Amino acid sequence: MKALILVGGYGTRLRPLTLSTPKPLVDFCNKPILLHQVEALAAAGVDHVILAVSYMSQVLEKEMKAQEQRLGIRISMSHEEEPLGTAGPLALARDLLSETADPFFVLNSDVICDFPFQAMVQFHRHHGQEGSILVTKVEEPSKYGVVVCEADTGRIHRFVEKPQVFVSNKINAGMYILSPAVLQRIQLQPTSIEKEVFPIMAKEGQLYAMELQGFWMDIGQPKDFLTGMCLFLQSLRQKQPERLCSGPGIVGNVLVDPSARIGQNCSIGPNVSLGPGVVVEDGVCIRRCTVLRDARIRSHSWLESCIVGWRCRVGQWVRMENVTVLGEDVIVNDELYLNGASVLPHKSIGESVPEPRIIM
Template identity: 35%
Template structure:
């Protein structure tokens, strides 16, 4: 049996205000907490035991997922008292693992939406005899990422910082945030202090002559660290572009949860999600947007690539494009917000004195 560690302790500061009241892995994507998709994909790959390494708002996870039996899993929870970094978090849960010293342990970052072939990564790890195997993906513009060059056999050669000049871009391969560790490598990580696998563990292993194997899998991959990426990932799940057995309905242009109310002439497109108890008014046009439970969008509002928080209210004829509206916030009628605007939780944006036509 392969078991796994899920790193879900991050504060999600780039996702605020979504993460003020909710840890990043619990923000809904395609109708369920994002973590549900990761757990379901791991279970589909044969994983049965998963330890969640929690920290920020740690008390939220176990009441929702319990022991994991509803997903066919056995879940355990370990909370960091102080932030320990990726490597420190992995080491902190080692006592809950059941694997022997030579057995493989899967590790996933809690904010990556991916179509990774998990079984293939484990197979590469076992056939190569690696100490650690890494999922690598290729990106068109690697300047925002650390680079991971490999040799002709896929063996990792180095971990390079974000390139500053074109000459430093020696590969388009980046660390995609999923690994297989030999259990003994986890036990060798220093305990009780912050450790970064990217900046300390992996470079130190390379320097000591350990075998780090890369597997390039360039299927769907998205870092959900920003609101724009999170909204896109949710839409891609609904549209079927990103695979998950946990989407609560058929893939298509929209996903309307059972207790939501949508006016007959409202138009929902682009992977839009309407959460439980949400209300969409007449003539609203909503594209590639997530409307969380209990929110209300009034008549004639036009929303695109946005996220509307729980119990938030978008007034009539308001236009939102690439906007996050926090939980409980109100954006009054006839407003127009664009280009990454964020409305904080429980804030009120007064109705505008300028009237917008929904056709503009």
């Protein structure tokens, strides 16, 4: 099939991470999240996907042009200079996606599940109308478009009603199979697919709703980034137990990259994903954390529920907790305490942050 991941957004949620690199090139469990979705597409049999680029096209173009030939598929990219939202990508790319009368796949980048492409195309053949979404039921999140669905038919009566769920209990997981007939309904203008097309789509009855098995998380937020990392390591425990590292100083599910290094007398606790090149010295405790490429974590420090970005140097006897995000090349001095520090890139910290702040 031909597919489409709209990957151009300014990652304003997940901001210090998405200041250096784009949001799809943020390394999520030792492999970028665009690479997760496009690798699942290549597993599903989609022959062709094109990126819908708006911002930091350089790095995305380079890495994706390499991974094009990495795996046997023709993957081009549609470039936009003015950000047309998440719908204008459809009409910008309508030149090649209005060729045949076959449905195309539109995914958010920031969504990680296990991807039922074949189950949803099996779903989409039944109702035969324009658009299919998949949805996920969680109680507390209402950020996305919360949807109202039918019985095992699945037809959408209503969606996009504002937060005050009241027993709806289904939120759309941002993945669509659209017919090419709705390609002409969208126009070139800066438009959002989530709140412009889909409302009249829902009052027309053309959306249908496949709902998902389990392990879904959107990881556009750093707290949601660590929660999705927890879920993804749980799913890898239930699927590939040999990938998760296992030793005497390893608790729970830990995803150590082979290029990484872990010193002795150090307790890498549960739900940790060390990146390619990290140096965790002798005596560090790390639980629930994400450490990205080339980040050195010096000895006797204690990290819980925090993202440590690229080329960071965390000093000795440092305590970082409560979802602390560090940008690229952030240097924490020794014996400091960071609580909720959102640190921008290229900043050396010599002073504790005892309350959640944006260090700038």
